[PDB]
Structure 1
Amino acid sequence: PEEVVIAGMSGKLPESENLQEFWDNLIGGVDMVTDDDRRWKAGLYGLPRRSGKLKDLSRFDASFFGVHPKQAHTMDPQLRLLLEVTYEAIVDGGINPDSLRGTHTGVWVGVSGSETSEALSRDPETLVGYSMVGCQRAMMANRLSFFFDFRGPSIALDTACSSSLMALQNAYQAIHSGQCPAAIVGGINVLLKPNTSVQFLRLGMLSPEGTCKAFDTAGNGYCRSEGVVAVLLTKKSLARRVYATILNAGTNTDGFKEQGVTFPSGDIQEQLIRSLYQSAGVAPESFEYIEAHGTGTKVGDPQELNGITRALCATRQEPLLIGSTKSNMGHPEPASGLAALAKVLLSLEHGLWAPNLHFHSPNPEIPALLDGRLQVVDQPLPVRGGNVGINSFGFGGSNVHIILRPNTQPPPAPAPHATLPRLLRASGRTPEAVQKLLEQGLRHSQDLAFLSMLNDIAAVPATAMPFRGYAVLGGERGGPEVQQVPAGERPLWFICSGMGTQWRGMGLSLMRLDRFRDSILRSDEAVKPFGLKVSQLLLSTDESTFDDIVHSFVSLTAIQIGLIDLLSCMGLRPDGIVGHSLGEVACGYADGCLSQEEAVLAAYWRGQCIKEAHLPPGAMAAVGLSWEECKQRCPPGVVPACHNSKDTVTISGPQAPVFEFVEQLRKEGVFAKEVRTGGMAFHSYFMEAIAPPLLQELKKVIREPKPRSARWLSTSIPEAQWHSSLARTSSAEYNVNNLVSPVLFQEALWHVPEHAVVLEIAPHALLQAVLKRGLKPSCTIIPLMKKDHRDNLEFFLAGIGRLHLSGIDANPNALFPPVEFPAPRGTPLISPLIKWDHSLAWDVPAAEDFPNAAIYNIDTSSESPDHYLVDHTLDGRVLFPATGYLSIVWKTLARALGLGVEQLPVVFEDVVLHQATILPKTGTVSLEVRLLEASRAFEVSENGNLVVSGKVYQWDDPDPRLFDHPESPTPNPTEPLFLAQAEVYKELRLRGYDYGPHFQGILEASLEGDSGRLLWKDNWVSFMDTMLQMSILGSAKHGLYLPTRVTAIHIDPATHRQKLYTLQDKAQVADVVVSRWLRVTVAGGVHISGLHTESAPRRQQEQQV
C-alpha cells in the first residue's frame, strides 16, 4: 500500500483563533480555560465555573461558500467554522483545493453534539426547512463534500471522546488500501446547552474546580471545552509538506466490563498499543513521547498509565516522556484526539514539547511515575527524535491509537538559484488578507519551499477572491502591490517590436535563469555554422556588437524567442499576436508556424542579405504628421514606411530628401525625430532589390511552409488581402513581402478586444507609448524589459506580477528550478495566514433557547405591517398608542382561548398605563404579554419594566343595548356648522397632537365635540385611538393630555360589523357619541367608560430657534 502523511492542519481551539495562537498559548504556559460568561452565566445549576470556549462563533464568510444569508443564520456554528477550518487545512498543505475537486477524496468528521438543531426546531409554527439541511449531523461532512466537490465517502462518526481520532483512523485505512487519494479528518465540539454539562456533572465526570489536572494526585474529573480542528491526509505522492507519517492506526473496544460501561479498562488499551506497534514493525524502544488521554479522572489515569507502562516501558532504558494537552485547553469530547494531534505536530515543527499545566505531584497508584520510567513534560523539553504515540479513549469504551513518525527533512543546501530574486503572488478575500500573505512571505523571503507553496495556492479565480497582490522578493527594491481584480476574462496579446530596441549588454540579467539560457544556447546551436554566437554577442562589451545589423537581428530574434519560451513555460497562451516590422518571425514562432531554428536562420539570412546589397544609404525618421497628410506630403523617393499610429508615421528613403522633409516638418512644428536606421533604408523601394536573394535564401532555410493561425494578425498584408496566398502560409514569400511591404501596425490595433492585456515581447518596450495612444483605453500594457535597467530580471518579475494582478493566471514557479519535496521541517504554517471576510455576524443559539409569554416586536420599517404607527406622533416623538397595548392583549387572549380576534368579544377593566414606550426610528421594541386565566389579570412589560396592567376576560353574554348611543349632553345643538377632518386636526395640532394620515380617522365632529363620525380602515388600534381623540377634542383644558386609566372597555365585533354604514364613497364609517356627564364614549361596537387623562409635560427638546 501507499504511505499516509498529514499534509495540512488547521483549527480553532479554546482561546486561540488559529494554530499560531494555540502554539503561543501552549509554549507560553498560558492556561486556555476561562471563567467568563460568554456561553451561559457562570455557576448555573451548580456547574463548574471554568471551561474552554472559542473566542467567537458568530463569524462566517458566507459569500465565499455560496450560502444565502437566510441559510447562514440557520446553519450550525460547528459547520460554519468547519468549512473555513477545512479550507485553511487544505491550503496549509500547499495544495490548491481546485486540484482535489472531482477526486474521490473522503471526508470523515467526528461530531457528538446537535445542540444547534434542537434550538432551531423548537417552534413548529416558525421552524424552516433550512435548519434541517444546515444543522443535521449528517450534513457536517456532506456540506464539505458538496462545497469542495469530493466524490469519496462522507461519514459523520458519533463515538464519544474518540470521534475525531476514529475518523482519522478510518481515513488512514481508506487511503492505505488505495480507496482514496486524500482524506479530510475533522472533529468539532461547541458548548451551547447547559443541560448536557449538567448531565456530565451528575455522572461525576466533571471536576468541581473546572481544571483537568492530568497525572496529578488531585484529579476530580475533566472540564469541558470546545474546539474545531481539521486535518488533510494524503498519500505520499500528493503531499507538499509532511508534518508526520502515520505508521499504523488501530481501534478496539473494551467489551464487557465488570465495573460498568464508563469504567475504563487498561488491559484492552495495552493490547491495542502492543498490537499496533507490533504490526507496524516499530520496536517499543523507538518511542520518545506518548500523548496519553490524561483526562485527570481518579480511575482513568492510573488505568491508562499502567497500560502504557506494561506495553511500552517494559524494556526501554531511557524514560518515556508522557504528556497531555487537556491540562492546557480542557477536554473537547469528540475533537480531543485532533487537538492532541495538533499539539504534537506543533511541538515537532518547533522542536519543543509543550508542557503540562497543573501537574505538581504524581498519582501514587501510578508506580511508573514514582520510579521514573515515565517522565512528564513539566518544562519545555527539546525534541530528540523518535516515533510519537497518540491515543484517545472514549468514555463508552472505544479505543483509538496512532503511531507517528515525525518528519525530519533537513534544510536544503544553498544553491545559486537562491541568490536571484523570486516572485511572490498572493490572493485574498480582502486587502488585509493579501497584505498578510505578502508580508509573511517577505519575512521569510529566503525560504524557497515556503514561497513555492504560497505561489501554488495563489491561483484562485477573481470571482472567489477579488483582491490580488504581488511582491518581488530579494530584489534591489520593490514593495508589495495590492489591488482589486476586475471580474471577467481578459484576452492576452503578444506584441513583438521591431528594430531599434537592441542595446549593449541586453539580456545578460535574464540569462541567470535556466529557461532563457537554454533558449539562447539552442539559438546559438541553430546559427552556429555562420560563426555568430548569440551568447558572445550578448556578453560582448564592445558597443559595436549591436551596431552591426546582422548581430542586431540575430540577438533581437533570440531574445524575443527566449522571452516567448519563458512566457510559455508558465502556461500562458496568447489570444492574439501582432508584429511590428521585424519580429514577425518571432511572432511566427510564438504562433507556432515557425520553429526556433527556422526563425533564427530566417532572421540571420534576412540580415546578411541586407548587408551584401551595399545599397545607397537611407535614413528613416518618425514624423509627427498623420499618415494621410504625410503620405501625400512625402517628396519623390520618400514614402510612408510604418503606420505606427494616427499621430505619428515613420518614413524611410534617400538621406537628402528625407532630411530636407524633416527640416521642413520641424519648420511647421510637427513632431520630427530620426530613428536609428543604421544607414540602410527599411520598408522602401531599396529593399526591392534585396528581395530575390532573400527569398532564395529563405527557401533554402524554409522548406516546409505551414499555415498561419487565426490569432496572428499579419501587419505586412493589407486586411483586404488576408485571404490571399501569402497571408495563408508563413512561407519565405511572406517574410520577403513583409520586408518590403509597409508596416501597417496601427491598422491591426483596432482589432484588439476591449479589456485586452498586452505584453510587449521585446528587449526594450519601445512601442509602449504607441500602444498607449493607439489602443483601447481598457487595454493594459506590460513592458517585460527595459533599457539600461539595473536588473532586468526584477523588471520581468514585476511584469509577471502585474499580469497576475490583471486577472491572468501565470505561475512564477515554473521559471525557477523545482523545489525538492516534501518541504523541510520548520516551514512556516500557512493556515494562520488565511484571512476571511467577517464583517457580518450570524445568529447563534443562546442558553434561553433550550428548555429548563407572548412576544410582540413593534417594527416601524415601511415593509413592516405595523408601519402605520409612525403616523401617531405625540409632542414630536412617536409613542405606542394605548389602544396598541389593548389590541395586543386582545390578540393574546384570543390565541389563549383559540378563537380568532374578530370572534372574541372582550372586556377590559382597570387598565393602567404605568409608562409610555417610545418607538425608535431604527430597530424594534419587544413587548411581552403574560396572562393569568384564573385571576383574569394581564400584564404588558418591556425589558422587564411593567408598562400596562389591568384585567381582561371574554365577554360571555354580549348585550346590544350597551352600544346604543347614549342621551346627548345637549339635545339641540342646532348648528349647521361643524368641524371637518382638516379643522379637527388643525385644532389637535394646535393643542400638541401630530397625527398622520393613518390616525386621522375623524370625518367630522360637532362643534361641542360630543358627537361625530369616524372612519373604519379595518384597523382596531386606529379606530379606538380615534375614539380617544374625539373624547379629548371636547376638553376645554389646554395642553397635551394622554390616557392613564380606563375603568372598563367593552368590544363586540358583531355589533361593530352591524353598526358600520357606507357613505357615498366606498369608505366605511362608524357614528361616535361622547357623553361627558356619564363618562362614556360609544362608537360602533366599542364602548369606553371612565377614561382618565393626565397632563403630560408637553416639553420637547431642540425646539425651533
Structure 2
Amino acid sequence: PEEVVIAGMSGKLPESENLQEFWDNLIGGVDMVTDDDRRWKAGLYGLPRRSGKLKDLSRFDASFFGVHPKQAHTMDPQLRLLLEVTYEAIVDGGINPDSLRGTHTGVWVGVSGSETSEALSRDPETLVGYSMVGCQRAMMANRLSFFFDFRGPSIALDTACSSSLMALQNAYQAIHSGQCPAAIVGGINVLLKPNTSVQFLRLGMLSPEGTCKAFDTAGNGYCRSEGVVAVLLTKKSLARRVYATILNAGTNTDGFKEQGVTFPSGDIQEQLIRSLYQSAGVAPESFEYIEAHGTGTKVGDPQELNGITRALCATRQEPLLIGSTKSNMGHPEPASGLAALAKVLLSLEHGLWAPNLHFHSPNPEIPALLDGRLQVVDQPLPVRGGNVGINSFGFGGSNVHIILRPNTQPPPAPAPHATLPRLLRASGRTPEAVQKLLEQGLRHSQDLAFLSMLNDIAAVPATAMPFRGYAVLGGERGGPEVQQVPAGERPLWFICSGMGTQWRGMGLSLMRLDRFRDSILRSDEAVKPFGLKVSQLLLSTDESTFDDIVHSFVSLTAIQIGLIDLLSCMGLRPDGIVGHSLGEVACGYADGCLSQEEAVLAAYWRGQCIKEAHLPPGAMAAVGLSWEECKQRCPPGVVPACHNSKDTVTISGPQAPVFEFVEQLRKEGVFAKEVRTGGMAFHSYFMEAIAPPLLQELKKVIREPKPRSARWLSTSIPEAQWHSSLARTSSAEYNVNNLVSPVLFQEALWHVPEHAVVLEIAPHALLQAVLKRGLKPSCTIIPLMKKDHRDNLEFFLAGIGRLHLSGIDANPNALFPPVEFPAPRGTPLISPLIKWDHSLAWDVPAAEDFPNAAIYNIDTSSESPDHYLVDHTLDGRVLFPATGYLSIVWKTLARALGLGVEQLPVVFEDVVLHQATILPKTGTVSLEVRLLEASRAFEVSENGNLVVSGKVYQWDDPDPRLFDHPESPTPNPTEPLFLAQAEVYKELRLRGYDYGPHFQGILEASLEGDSGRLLWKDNWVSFMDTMLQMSILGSAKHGLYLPTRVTAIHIDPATHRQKLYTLQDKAQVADVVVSRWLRVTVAGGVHISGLHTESAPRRQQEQQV
C-alpha cells in the first residue's frame, strides 16, 4: 500500500476560536466549559447548567463561498463553520486548494444532529425551499465537495458518537487502497435543541455537576459540548507538512451484550486494540500515550481502562500514560475523536502532554490506576517518544481505534543560503488578514519551511482574495507593504534597456542566487575561447574595468540574460518584448529566437568589431526637443539616434558637430546632455563602415535564423516594414540594422495596452522616466536592479513583490534551493493565521424555534413521577386532588409566559370544579388545559368535558404583608394539648377521608382546628391539599366535603421560601392559620380565600358485609 499522513488540521472548539487558542487553554489549565446563557437559559428543564460552547456561530464569509445572502440565512451553522475550517485545514499543510480541484479526493463528515432542518421547516406555509440544500445531513460532505470540486466519495456518517473516528478510518482505508489521493475528515456538533440534552439527561448519561471527571471516583456523566474540527489526510507523496502517520485504524461493534445496548463492552475493545497493534507490526511497548475515551461514566471507564490494561499494559515495564481531552472541553459526541486527535497533535508539536483536569483521586475499580501500570497526566509531561493511540467508542456499540507514529523531523543543519534574504507574499480577504500573515512571517523569519509553505498558499486569484502583500525578510530595510488588487488580467511586458547602464561591481549581490550564477557561468563558457570571463569582469574592482566597449557589452548581455532566466524560473512568460538597441539581442533571447551562447557571442562580436575599426570621436548627446523639430534643428553630419519619447530625443554624430549643436542648445536653454559611450556616436552613419565585417562575423554567429514571435516588437524597423522579410526573423541582418538604424523606442511603446506591467530588465533602471512619460498613465514599470545600491537582491525581491501586488502570480520558491519535506517538527501552525471577512451576522436558530393546548397525562403507576396521587383516596376511590388542577394550570401559565413555576407568583380567581376525575387503577387519564390570556380565563377538559373553569393571571406586584398571620379570634392561652398527626388523620378517617402517607402532612394542629404546622416537600399539590384538610378539620359538619369553588388563591414562591423554617430534625415545616370569620387559609406563601365545600354522597359500596 501507501503511507497515510495527517497533512493539516483545523477547527473551532469550546472557548477556542482556533487551534492556537485551544492549545493556550489546554496548557494554561483553563476550563473551556462555561455556565453562560448562550444557547438557552441555564437550568431549563433541569438540564446541567454547564456546557462547553463555541464562542460565536453567526459569522460566515458567504461571498467567498458563492452562497447568496438568502441561502446563507437558511444554511446550517455547522456547514458554514465546516467550510471555513476545511479551507483552513487544506492551507495548514501548505497544499493550495486549487491543486486538489478536479482530484478524486473524497470528503467524509461525521455528524449526528440536524436540529436546523427541524427548525427551518416548522411552518409549512412560509418555509423556503433552499432550506433543504443547506441543512440536509447529506450536504455536510456534498457542499464541501461542490465548493472544492472533489470528485471522490462524499459520505456523511453517524455511527452514534464515533462518527469522526469512523470517517477517519474510512478515509485511511480509501487512501491506503489507492482509491483516493487525499481525504478531508470532519466532525460537527452544535447544541441548539434543549430537548436533546433533556433526553440524554433522562437516559442518565449527563453529569449533574456538568463536568466529565475522567478516571475519577466522582464520575457521574459527561458534559455536552460543541465542536467543528476538520483534518486533511494525504498520501506521503503529496504531504508538505506531516503531523503523524496512521499505522493502522480499525472498527468493530460490541454485538450482543446481555446488559443492554448502552453498556460499554471491554472485551471487544481489547480485541480490537490487540488485533490492530498486531496487524500493524507494532510492539505494545512502543506505545507512549493512549488517549482513552474518558467520558466519565461510572461503568464505561472501568471497562475501557481494564481493556487497555489487558491489551497493552500487561507485558511492559515502564508505565503507560493515559489521557482524556474531554475533561477539558467537554464531550462533543460526533466530533469527540477529532478533538482528541487535535489535542494529541498539538501536544506532540509543542513537546508537552496537555494535562488532564478534574482528577484528584483514582477510581478504585481500576487496579491499573492504583498500581503504576497506568499513569494519568495530571500535569505537563515532556514527550519522550513513541507511538500513540486514540479510541472513540459510541454508545451504540461502534468502536474505533487508530495507532499513530509521531513525526520526528529535526531542524535542518544550517546552510549558507539561509543567510540570504527571502520574500514573503500573502493574499487575504481583508487587509488585516494579510498583515497578520506578514507579521507571523516576520516573527519566524529564519524558518525556511514556514516561509515556503506560506508562499505556496498565497497563489490565489485576486477576485477571491482582493488584498495582497509582500515582505522581504533578512534585510535591514524590510517592511510589509499591502494594497488592494484590481481584478482582471494584466498583461506582462519586458523592456530591455540600452548601452548606458553599466557600473562598477554590478551583479555581485545577485551572484549569491543559484540560477544567476549558472547563467553567468554558461556565458563565461560561451565567451571562454576569446580569453575573457564575464565572472572575472563582474568581480573586478578597477573603475576602468568597464571603460572598454567589449567588456561592457558582454557583461551587460550576460546580466540581462541572467535576469531573464530568473524571471522564467518563477513561471513568468512575457506577453510583450521590447528592447533598446543593445537589448534586442537579450530580447531575442527572451522569445527563444536565439540561444544563450548565440546572444553572448553576438554581443562580444559587436563589441570587438566596434573596437576593430577606428572613427573620429563623436559624442551621442540627448536633447529635449520635438523629434520632427529636432530633424530640422540638427546640423550637418548628425542624425537622430533615439526616439526615446515624445520629448526625449538623443542625437549622435561627430564630436565637433555635437559640441557645436550642444552649445547652440545651451544658448536656447533647452535640455542638453551627452551619454558616455567612449565618445562613440552609435546608430549613425559612422556605423556604416563597421557593418560588413559585422555581418560576416554574425552570419557564422547565427547559423539558422528563426522567426520573431508576434510578442516581440521591433524598435529596429518601422511598423510599415513589420511584414518585411528582413525584420521577420532574428538574423545577422537584423543585428546589423539594429546597430545602424536609429532607435524607435517611442513608437513601440504605443502598443503597450492599458494596465500593463512592464519590467526594466537591465543592470540599472535607466529608462524609468522615459517609460513613465511614454506609456499610458495606468502602467507599472516595476524596476529590478539599481545603481550602487548596497544589496541588489533586496531590490530584485521587492520588484518581484511589487509584481505580486500588481496581479501577476510569481512564486519566489524557485529562486532559492528547494526545501525538503516533510517539514520539521515544531513549525508554526497556519490555521490560526487565516482570517475571514466576518462583517455580517447570519441567522442562527434560537431555543424558541423548537417545540416545548397544553395536555397532561396523569400516570399513577409506580414509575410515574405522579405516583403520589394514589394516596388521595376519598370514599375508597382515588380522585385527582382539587389543588392538582391548580398546579397543572400554573405550569401551563408559566410555560406560556416563559418562566419557571418557582419564579411565577400567580393568582387564581373564581375557580369552579364541575366534575371529579377518577384516576384509573390501570391506564391513564389525559387532561387538557387551555388559556385565554386576553380574557385571563382558563379551562381544564377531560375527553371533551369541562372539569375546572375560572381565571388565572400573573401577580404583578407580590406583597409579603398579605401572608401575615391573622390574629386568632380565640386566644387559646392554655394550649395544654394538641392533635398529633395520628389523631388528626384518625378523625379524618372517621369522616371518610382516607389520605395516604404522601398526603399526610399535618404534623400537628390545635384542638379548635385553626392553627397547626404543615410539612413541606417539593410538591405543591400535597401542601395545598393539606391546607384544605386543615380547613375541613374544624368544621362541625360530618360526612365528607369536597371543594367545589374557591373565590381567590394567591401563591408567591419567594415569600414561601422565606417562610419555611426547618424543625429540630431535618424536616421543613410551615405554620398555618385558619380564620373562619375572615374565610382565609394562610400557610407560607399560599393564601386561599372564599373556599366553599359541598357534601358528597357516600359511595355506599358497602364492600364490608
Structure 1 residues 720 and 959: alpha-carbon distance in aligned structure 2, compared to 1, 3 A threshold: farther
For the Cα contact (< 8 Å) 1:854–1:928, is it kept in 2?
yes
- Aligned-residue offset at 1:666: 1.4
Aligned to 1:573: 573
**How far, CA to CA, are the matches of 1:366 and 1:1014 in structure 2?**
48
For the Cα contact (< 8 Å) 1:284–1:312, is it kept in 2?
yes
Higher mean C-alpha displacement, 1078-1087 vs 200-209: 1078-1087
Higher mean C-alpha displacement, 23-32 vs 951-960: 951-960
Structure 1 residues 374 and 1099: alpha-carbon distance in aligned structure 2, compared to 1, 3 A threshold: closer
1:527-585 CA-partner distances (Å, limit 9, x unpaired): 11001100000000011211110000000000000000000000000000000121100
Higher mean C-alpha displacement, 737-746 vs 1058-1067: 1058-1067
**How far, CA to CA, are the matches of 2:432 and 2:230 in structure 1?**
24
- Aligned-residue offset at 1:476: 2.1
**How far, CA to CA, are the matches of 1:219 and 1:616 in structure 2?**
104
- Aligned-residue offset at 1:892: 23
1:375-399 CA-partner distances (Å, limit 9, x unpaired): 0001100000000000000010000
SS at match of 2:321: strand
- Aligned-residue offset at 1:775: 0.4
For the Cα contact (< 8 Å) 1:653–1:681, is it kept in 2?
yes
Structure 1 residues 679 and 863: alpha-carbon distance in aligned structure 2, compared to 1, 3 A threshold: farther
SS at match of 1:735: helix
- Aligned-residue offset at 1:1084: 59
SS at match of 1:618: coil
**How far, CA to CA, are the matches of 1:459 and 1:272 in structure 2?**
44
Aligned to 2:630: 630
Aligned to 1:821: 821
SS at match of 1:665: helix
Structure 1 residues 905 and 628: alpha-carbon distance in aligned structure 2, compared to 1, 3 A threshold: farther
1:570-626 CA-partner distances (Å, limit 9, x unpaired): 000000000012110000001110110000000100110001111111101110111
Higher mean C-alpha displacement, 348-357 vs 1093-1102: 1093-1102
- Aligned-residue offset at 1:678: 1.3
- Aligned-residue offset at 1:959: 50
1:261-300 CA-partner distances (Å, limit 9, x unpaired): 0000000000000000000000000000000000010000
Aligned to 1:961: 961
- Aligned-residue offset at 1:1038: 69
1:835-873 CA-partner distances (Å, limit 9, x unpaired): 000000000000000000999999999999999999999
Structure 1 residues 278 and 660: alpha-carbon distance in aligned structure 2, compared to 1, 3 A threshold: same
1:884-923 CA-partner distances (Å, limit 9, x unpaired): 9999999999999999999999999999999999999999
Q: How does 1:50-199 map to 2 (within 5 A)?
A: 50-199=50-199
Structure 1 residues 641 and 1066: alpha-carbon distance in aligned structure 2, compared to 1, 3 A threshold: farther
**How far, CA to CA, are the matches of 1:991 and 1:670 in structure 2?**
132
Structure 1 residues 947 and 57: alpha-carbon distance in aligned structure 2, compared to 1, 3 A threshold: farther
SS at match of 1:546: helix
SS at match of 1:758: coil
**How far, CA to CA, are the matches of 1:997 and 1:626 in structure 2?**
118
Structure 1 residues 730 and 985: alpha-carbon distance in aligned structure 2, compared to 1, 3 A threshold: farther
**How far, CA to CA, are the matches of 2:371 and 2:1084 in structure 1?**
95
Aligned to 2:932: 932
Structure 1 residues 283 and 499: alpha-carbon distance in aligned structure 2, compared to 1, 3 A threshold: same
1:690-723 CA-partner distances (Å, limit 9, x unpaired): 1111011000111110001000000011110000
1:16-57 CA-partner distances (Å, limit 9, x unpaired): 000000000000110100000111010110000101000000
1:473-508 CA-partner distances (Å, limit 9, x unpaired): 011211000110001010000000011101000000
Structure 1 residues 273 and 629: alpha-carbon distance in aligned structure 2, compared to 1, 3 A threshold: same
Structure 1 residues 535 and 930: alpha-carbon distance in aligned structure 2, compared to 1, 3 A threshold: farther
For the Cα contact (< 8 Å) 1:762–1:785, is it kept in 2?
yes
What is the percent sequence identity of the aligned residues? 100
**How far, CA to CA, are the matches of 1:76 and 1:940 in structure 2?**
40
Q: How does 1:389-538 map to 2 (within 5 A)?
A: 389-538=389-538
Structure 1 residues 333 and 721: alpha-carbon distance in aligned structure 2, compared to 1, 3 A threshold: same
Q: How many residues align?
A: 1105
Structure 1 residues 75 and 1033: alpha-carbon distance in aligned structure 2, compared to 1, 3 A threshold: farther
Structure 1 residues 28 and 1072: alpha-carbon distance in aligned structure 2, compared to 1, 3 A threshold: closer
Structure 1 residues 458 and 1079: alpha-carbon distance in aligned structure 2, compared to 1, 3 A threshold: farther
Higher mean C-alpha displacement, 6-15 vs 861-870: 861-870
**How far, CA to CA, are the matches of 1:205 and 1:968 in structure 2?**
53
Structure 1 residues 952 and 342: alpha-carbon distance in aligned structure 2, compared to 1, 3 A threshold: closer
Q: How does 1:306-705 map to 2 (within 5 A)?
A: 306-705=306-705
**How far, CA to CA, are the matches of 1:35 and 1:767 in structure 2?**
68
**How far, CA to CA, are the matches of 1:861 and 1:612 in structure 2?**
121
**How far, CA to CA, are the matches of 1:868 and 1:1082 in structure 2?**
24
- Aligned-residue offset at 1:516: 0.2
Rg larger for: 2
SS at match of 1:782: coil
Structure 1 residues 783 and 981: alpha-carbon distance in aligned structure 2, compared to 1, 3 A threshold: farther
- Aligned-residue offset at 1:819: 0.1
SS at match of 1:746: helix
* TM score, norm. by length of structure 1: 0.79
Higher mean C-alpha displacement, 716-725 vs 1040-1049: 1040-1049
- Aligned-residue offset at 1:1080: 47
**How far, CA to CA, are the matches of 1:575 and 1:651 in structure 2?**
31
For the Cα contact (< 8 Å) 1:26–1:354, is it kept in 2?
yes
For the Cα contact (< 8 Å) 1:362–1:369, is it kept in 2?
yes
**How far, CA to CA, are the matches of 2:70 and 2:1048 in structure 1?**
45
- Aligned-residue offset at 1:727: 1.3
1:998-1027 CA-partner distances (Å, limit 9, x unpaired): 999999999999999999999999999999
1:152-190 CA-partner distances (Å, limit 9, x unpaired): 000000112100000000000000000000000000000
**How far, CA to CA, are the matches of 1:770 and 1:880 in structure 2?**
102
Structure 1 residues 1069 and 649: alpha-carbon distance in aligned structure 2, compared to 1, 3 A threshold: farther
- Aligned-residue offset at 1:677: 2.3
Structure 1 residues 327 and 1007: alpha-carbon distance in aligned structure 2, compared to 1, 3 A threshold: closer
Structure 1 residues 863 and 262: alpha-carbon distance in aligned structure 2, compared to 1, 3 A threshold: closer
**How far, CA to CA, are the matches of 1:782 and 1:865 in structure 2?**
81
For the Cα contact (< 8 Å) 1:609–1:694, is it kept in 2?
yes
Structure 1 residues 876 and 265: alpha-carbon distance in aligned structure 2, compared to 1, 3 A threshold: closer
Structure 1 residues 904 and 213: alpha-carbon distance in aligned structure 2, compared to 1, 3 A threshold: closer
Structure 1 residues 925 and 450: alpha-carbon distance in aligned structure 2, compared to 1, 3 A threshold: farther
**How far, CA to CA, are the matches of 1:1036 and 1:495 in structure 2?**
119
SS at match of 1:994: coil
Higher mean C-alpha displacement, 1067-1076 vs 298-307: 1067-1076
For the Cα contact (< 8 Å) 1:618–1:677, is it kept in 2?
no
- Aligned-residue offset at 1:125: 0.5
Higher mean C-alpha displacement, 805-814 vs 1092-1101: 1092-1101
**How far, CA to CA, are the matches of 2:808 and 2:316 in structure 1?**
59
For the Cα contact (< 8 Å) 1:969–1:1010, is it kept in 2?
no
**How far, CA to CA, are the matches of 2:922 and 2:614 in structure 1?**
88
Higher mean C-alpha displacement, 951-960 vs 605-614: 951-960
**How far, CA to CA, are the matches of 2:525 and 2:1092 in structure 1?**
110
Structure 1 residues 482 and 1017: alpha-carbon distance in aligned structure 2, compared to 1, 3 A threshold: farther
Aligned to 1:45: 45
Structure 1 residues 372 and 668: alpha-carbon distance in aligned structure 2, compared to 1, 3 A threshold: same
- Aligned-residue offset at 1:406: 0.1
Structure 1 residues 1075 and 731: alpha-carbon distance in aligned structure 2, compared to 1, 3 A threshold: farther
For the Cα contact (< 8 Å) 1:969–1:1076, is it kept in 2?
no
Structure 1 residues 702 and 887: alpha-carbon distance in aligned structure 2, compared to 1, 3 A threshold: farther
**How far, CA to CA, are the matches of 1:104 and 1:954 in structure 2?**
63
Q: In structure 2, list runs of 5 or more residues that go unmatched.
A: none
Structure 1 residues 251 and 978: alpha-carbon distance in aligned structure 2, compared to 1, 3 A threshold: closer
**How far, CA to CA, are the matches of 2:218 and 2:101 in structure 1?**
50
SS at match of 1:160: helix
- Aligned-residue offset at 1:1103: 87
For the Cα contact (< 8 Å) 1:163–1:187, is it kept in 2?
yes
